[PDB]
Amino acid sequence: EKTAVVIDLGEAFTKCGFAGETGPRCIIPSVIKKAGMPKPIKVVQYNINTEELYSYLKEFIHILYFRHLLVNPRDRRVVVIESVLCPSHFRETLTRVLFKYFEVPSVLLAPSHLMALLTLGINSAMVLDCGYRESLVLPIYEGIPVLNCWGALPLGGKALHKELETQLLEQCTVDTGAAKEQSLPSVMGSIPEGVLEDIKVRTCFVSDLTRGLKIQAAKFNIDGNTERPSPPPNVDYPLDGEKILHVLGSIRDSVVEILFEQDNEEKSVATLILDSLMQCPIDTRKQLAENLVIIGGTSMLPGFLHRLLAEIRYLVEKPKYKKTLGTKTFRIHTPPAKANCVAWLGGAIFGALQDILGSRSVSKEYYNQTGRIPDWCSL
Amino acid sequence: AALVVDNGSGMCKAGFAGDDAPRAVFPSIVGRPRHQGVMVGMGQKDSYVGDEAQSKRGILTLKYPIEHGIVTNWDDMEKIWHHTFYNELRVAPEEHPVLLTEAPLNPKANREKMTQIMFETFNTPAMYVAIQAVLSLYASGRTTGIVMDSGDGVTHTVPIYEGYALPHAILRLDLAGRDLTDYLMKILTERGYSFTTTAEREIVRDIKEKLCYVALDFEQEMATAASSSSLEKSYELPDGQVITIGNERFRCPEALFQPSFLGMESCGIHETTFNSIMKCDVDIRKDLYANTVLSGGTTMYPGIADRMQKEITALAPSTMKIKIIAPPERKYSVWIGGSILASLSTFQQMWISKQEYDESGPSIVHRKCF
Amino acid sequence: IANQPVVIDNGSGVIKAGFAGDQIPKYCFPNYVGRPKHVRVMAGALEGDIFIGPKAEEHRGLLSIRYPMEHGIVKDWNDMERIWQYVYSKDQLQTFSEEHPVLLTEAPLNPRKNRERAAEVFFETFNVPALFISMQAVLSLYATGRTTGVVLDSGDGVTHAVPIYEGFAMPHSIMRIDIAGRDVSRFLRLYLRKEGYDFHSSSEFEIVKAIKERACYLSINPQKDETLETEKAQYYLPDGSTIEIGPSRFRAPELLFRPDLIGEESEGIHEVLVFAIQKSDMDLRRTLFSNIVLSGGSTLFKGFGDRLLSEVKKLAPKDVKIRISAPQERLYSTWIGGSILASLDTFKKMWVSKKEYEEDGARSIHRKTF
Amino acid sequence: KEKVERDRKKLARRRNYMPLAFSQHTKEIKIEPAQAVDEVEPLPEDYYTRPVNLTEVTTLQQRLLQPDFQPICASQLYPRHKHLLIKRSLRCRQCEHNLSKPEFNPTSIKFKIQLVAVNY
Ligand SMILES: Nc1ncnc2c1ncn2[C@@H]1O[C@H](COP(=O)(O)OP(=O)(O)OP(=O)(O)O)[C@@H](O)[C@H]1O
Ligand SMILES: Nc1ncnc2c1ncn2[C@@H]1O[C@H](COP(=O)(O)OP(=O)(O)O)[C@@H](O)[C@H]1O
Numbered sequence A: 001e002k003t004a005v006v007i008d009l010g011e012a013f014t015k016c017g018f019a020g021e022t023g024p025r026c027i028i029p030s031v032i033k034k035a036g037m038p039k040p041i042k043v044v045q046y047n048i049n050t051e052e053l054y055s056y057l058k059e060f061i062h063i064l065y066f067r068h069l070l071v072n073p074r075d076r077r078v079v080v081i082e083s084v085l086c087p088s089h090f091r092e093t094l095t096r097v098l099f100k101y102f103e104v105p106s107v108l109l110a111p112s113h114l115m116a117l118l119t120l121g122i123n124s125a126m127v128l129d130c131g132y133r134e135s136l137v138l139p140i141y142e143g144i145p146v147l148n149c150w151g152a153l154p155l156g157g158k159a160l161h162k163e164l165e166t167q168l169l170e171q172c173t174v175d176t177g178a179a180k181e182q183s184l185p186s187v188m189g190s191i192p193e194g195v196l197e198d199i200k201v202r203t204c205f206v207s208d209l210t211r212g213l214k215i216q217a218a219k220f221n222i223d224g225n226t227e228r229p230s231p232p233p234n235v236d237y238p239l240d241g242e243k244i245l246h247v248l249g250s251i252r253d254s255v256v257e258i259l260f261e262q263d264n265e266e267k268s269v270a271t272l273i274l275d276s277l278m279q280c281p282i283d284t285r286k287q288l289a290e291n292l293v294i295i296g297g298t299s300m301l302p303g304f305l306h307r308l309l310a311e312i313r314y315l316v317e318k319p320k321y322k323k324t325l326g327t328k329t330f331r332i333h334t335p336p337a338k339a340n341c342v343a344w345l346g347g348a349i350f351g352a353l354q355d356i357l358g359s360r361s362v363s364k365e366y367y368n369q370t371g372r373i374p375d376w377c378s379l
Numbered sequence B: 001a002a003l004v005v006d007n008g009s010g011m012c013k014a015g016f017a018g019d020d021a022p023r024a025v026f027p028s029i030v031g032r033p034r035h036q037g038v039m040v041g042m043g044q045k046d047s048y049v050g051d052e053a054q055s056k057r058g059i060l061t062l063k064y065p066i067e068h069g070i071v072t073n074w075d076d077m078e079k080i081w082h083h084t085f086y087n088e089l090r091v092a093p094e095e096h097p098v099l100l101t102e103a104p105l106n107p108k109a110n111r112e113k114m115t116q117i118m119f120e121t122f123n124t125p126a127m128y129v130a131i132q133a134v135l136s137l138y139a140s141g142r143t144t145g146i147v148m149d150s151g152d153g154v155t156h157t158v159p160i161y162e163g164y165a166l167p168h169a170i171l172r173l174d175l176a177g178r179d180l181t182d183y184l185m186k187i188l189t190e191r192g193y194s195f196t197t198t199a200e201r202e203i204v205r206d207i208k209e210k211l212c213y214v215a216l217d218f219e220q221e222m223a224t225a226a227s228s229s230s231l232e233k234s235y236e237l238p239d240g241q242v243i244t245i246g247n248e249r250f251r252c253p254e255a256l257f258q259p260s261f262l263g264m265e266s267c268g269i270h271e272t273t274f275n276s277i278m279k280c281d282v283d284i285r286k287d288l289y290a291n292t293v294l295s296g297g298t299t300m301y302p303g304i305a306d307r308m309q310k311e312i313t314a315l316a317p318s319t320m321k322i323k324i325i326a327p328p329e330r331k332y333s334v335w336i337g338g339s340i341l342a343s344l345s346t347f348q349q350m351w352i353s354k355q356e357y358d359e360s361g362p363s364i365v366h367r368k369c370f
Numbered sequence C: 001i002a003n004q005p006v007v008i009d010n011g012s013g014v015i016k017a018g019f020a021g022d023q024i025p026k027y028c029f030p031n032y033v034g035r036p037k038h039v040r041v042m043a044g045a046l047e048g049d050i051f052i053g054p055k056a057e058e059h060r061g062l063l064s065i066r067y068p069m070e071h072g073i074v075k076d077w078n079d080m081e082r083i084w085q086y087v088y089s090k091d092q093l094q095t096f097s098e099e100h101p102v103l104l105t106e107a108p109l110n111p112r113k114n115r116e117r118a119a120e121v122f123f124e125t126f127n128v129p130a131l132f133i134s135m136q137a138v139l140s141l142y143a144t145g146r147t148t149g150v151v152l153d154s155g156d157g158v159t160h161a162v163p164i165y166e167g168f169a170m171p172h173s174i175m176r177i178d179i180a181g182r183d184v185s186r187f188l189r190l191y192l193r194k195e196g197y198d199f200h201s202s203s204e205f206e207i208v209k210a211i212k213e214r215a216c217y218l219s220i221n222p223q224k225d226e227t228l229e230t231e232k233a234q235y236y237l238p239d240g241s242t243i244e245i246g247p248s249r250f251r252a253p254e255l256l257f258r259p260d261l262i263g264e265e266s267e268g269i270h271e272v273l274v275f276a277i278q279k280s281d282m283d284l285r286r287t288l289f290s291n292i293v294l295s296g297g298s299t300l301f302k303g304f305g306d307r308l309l310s311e312v313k314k315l316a317p318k319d320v321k322i323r324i325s326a327p328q329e330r331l332y333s334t335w336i337g338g339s340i341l342a343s344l345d346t347f348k349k350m351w352v353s354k355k356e357y358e359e360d361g362a363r364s365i366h367r368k369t370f
Numbered sequence D: 001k002e003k004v005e006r007d008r009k010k011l012a013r014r015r016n017y018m019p020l021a022f023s024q025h026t027k028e029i030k031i032e033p034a035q036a037v038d039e040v041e042p043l044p045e046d047y048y049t050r051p052v053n054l055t056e057v058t059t060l061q062q063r064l065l066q067p068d069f070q071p072i073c074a075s076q077l078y079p080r081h082k083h084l085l086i087k088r089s090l091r092c093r094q095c096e097h098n099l100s101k102p103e104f105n106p107t108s109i110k111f112k113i114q115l116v117a118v119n120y
């Protein structure tokens, strides 16, 4: 047998490499540069025609299997990591591309949350997945994902990128280099997603709960006269060479707060753990609480894990969660690989198990016969 | 060298003949997971059993294989016996002969199919089925006297005088520990604390065992429960959440003494014990009043013996002296009897062999049962 | 006071109000409190911080929906007081609560604290002449006009099966499971995300309930419809955008009849009906199968009666007549029953007066319930 | 263990003897599960009231090229080995061979089997 390849198709970035390795070999933006198109189209797009999606995935998998990885597709197996409740037609297409065009031996559709649990070694743990599109949580108890007690909110990368763009356009101060030393607002109508992502990573950080709670009430201005903490210094960011955008200190520590803002509904990234944990079985409560896992690149943002764990323990004392989750000890697990590449590492650890892989995985001979991929929906 | 294996509906007590207490005591349950179409993680057992299923209660649907001392699912019971011999006891069933326990006045198919498995599946050298009540007397070193062996599955009253049992005087009542556990859920749901799932029912059994106690005067206890909050005790769940059960503490075990609460329309555990003695011969009644034994774990309720004495004394004549026999080890009263029986050299002859089973069939058990 | 009594159904999803004289409930509005989604500091926004029923439906996308009652139990009492205050508003009824007496319809086997607090509010906050808490199941029979009948009342919050024979309800044979219409709405949202349409917001949960109510058919065989390629019927949203539901349409309400699929440990809607009949005495079983009544909104699913009949038949004994008599007004059946009950002169005796509650104590409401 | 269990289960189904007990039925590796920290390290107080030089911190593109330990600072970021390129050979569905390249494709523009639509 040969070392099975691991792919993990995401909206922002795709993880790729081989099984039984310390981390992924290639990690790249999930896009393709088609002739005529100035900006490259995104390879994973939900709610489009199958033929157009088929062509994009055919183009992308080709780049992964030749330019990034150097190996024959037909020779060795595949371990496709994809999140639970991934759209039906997308997963059906992705398999149909691998089985028909590339003619792979067998694909294994592992849920990202159960794979993240294997990397630690613990059999039972709560898993939060703060991705690009949606920040999803799914309790895993001793190998069994509990779909009953699922939770998701659109407070990921996309929702954060959009919030940054909005704030920058309000307090817009750019030095074009054409008598634009004076503050010039909205010279460009929209900012490209590639720039916004680079600003987010380098400039913006996650504030402490004490400082963050003041920032929330400050921008609200709820019958108070200038009750904001002192912001960090303003950082100057180059746009397309000559144009120098002066990023305000307030924007850096306020953009993140949309994730941890209550917004009346009581629906934050913090609340989603406690909302799910309260809905879980009464016996499982204390085991899941003690074993928390925080995967996804959105949680890589500096000082996110401290704010989350703090915001949890504050929301615990709130009267809604005070009865059930009152006297619970919330402890976070530190996975071996980085927060972005926890999902991938599980699939590699699973891919190294050649004996179990072949049995669980769906063979091409079965797919060609039936034409029915197994899912958590009815058969 | 011989094995005693009590097949109780609540807990399966198994061990070696001659030993003081049973070696392996685990809850008699099979844990099948609430699986979706999503793939399962590693270290996955298709069906968990006993202490393993008791650890992984959260996800697994707990299904008791024996219901009212009748084996409903035999495939499940086979998996428990496989966990009993191979894993728990660490002994081959082909080497040692196995003594099992059946409740009295059970269906004939139960004893028939029980022995068939032991002889064919496990290939045991000898197999003897015994009445739980008959064994329970040996524990107290008493040949004479009636027993009120109330289990999780059933409660039965077997009067035995001078080492001779009265079969027609035997009375069976379906009211037992599991019905009380089911009753305790309903009245706890009336207070506020809702328990629905099979895993939650197991937590309600832990609440029952620890807090619940038998009241001497129920009407007097309800008056004190209403006025003062002295009887109200707190219990911590597996979750940090704590609950204050209140009057429902002593309301649960009352169902034993008056089944009207459960709504069975039958005689109480006190009244059935009296009725059984009255069905017996007039002469021997004296000793049965003097030697009334309480066996099983449904007679480990704090102050059942005091309430039992009071209720029997009222029904029974005034001149008679009513003494209730409550040994410290009531839970293991069925097994400890089995250990004494199996050890005795006389019992060596009473064993049913494979040769005897092969020639006659499984019907031989009905002749050499009791 | 002789002035006409006000019937009010405490439906988790939709509360139905009106006078006892009316043949149908004039005022029935959704049971949820509407507050502005964005925390309003500024002027020119939604004022009051309270939007109930038709006002909420108008400005739905702007507000944040919070249901005060979950699984036939009141979680937030402050919210429920505002809802009952809106029942006695200029919008609906337009009367004094102090003048007219009241009839509540609490689900069976609810917490006793739920009934006690419900009475306290209606006696203290509103100055009611008299109050009477009743079972939802018992009313449903008055509406149809038959004494004997099992009532499978599938509401939004709770689905319960109560067997009543010749005006006698067996309280032990009652069966209650939490998997109701609201859970079907929750599971449909999950399958809609599996089709690729997110409804993350609490306002966006309301349109999932609308999608369910509009387009969701129960297939007689679920396995055949899954293999068959779907039409993918388009539904139009409030904004104007179209969504192709496809296979999610039929495999969402299936979770009523088979709740193990998602991973919820419950019996199922076909099972609770049969179990409730089988739990009752053997003589009545035939008549209770011969008289089944569907109540509540979570029976109006297209081909519910067709599936239930088939699923009941295989579980029920062979060659037994099974008549599932659904009225045309299933959603409003529970209220019509109360409206008839309230009109009768016997109701004058049944309810508890305000002075009675002050003197007798707390028990007054509980003891007069039945 | 699962393979042996699945094999034993499968050969028992294939045999179709209804689990007939002919013979007697029935070293361990134990990993310690990772310890959960009570409190994760907070964001350093330096980040508050300090000028951020965009030269010192690394962009996403150059962060992600070193995935095994993607470092925020530039001083941590080490140079990775140069990525090897591929020499493609085409094979059809119906037809077998089609075209291919030599064993010394480095500094060579020669095809072992030249085939193209413009050349027919
Ligand atoms: N200390 C206790 N106090 C009250 N109830 C108890 C106590 N211990 C156990 N119980 C209850 O009574 C039952 C006793 O079961 P036990 O361990 O005696 O096995 P069993 O299945 O009843 O066996 P057998 O029928 O042979 O006696 C338990 O299932 C539990 O519900
Ligand atoms: N190392 C990093 N540091 C900070 N932010 C990151 C880092 N890597 C990714 N991110 C951000 O978090 C997001 C993570 O998305 P990712 O989990 O890779 O995608 P998906 O959820 O589709 O699988 C990216 O879109 C990016 O904005």
Ligand SMILES: Nc1ncnc2c1ncn2[C@@H]1O[C@H](COP(=O)(O)OP(=O)(O)O)[C@@H](O)[C@H]1O
Residues within 6 Å of the ligand: C009, C010, C011, C012, C013, C014, C015, C154, C155, C156, C157, C181, C182, C185, C209, C212, C213, C214, C295, C296, C297, C298, C300, C301, C330, C331, C334
């Ligand atoms: N026509 C319909 N088709 C399908 N489901 C419906 C329909 N009407 C109502 N429902 C469902 O039933 C619920 C109404 O329950 P309802 O009968 O008001 O309960 P209750 O008896 O507790 O008042 C709605 O919230 C919805 O989920």
Ligand SMILES: [Zn+2]
Residues within 6 Å of the ligand: D092, D094, D095
């Ligand atoms: Zn060709």
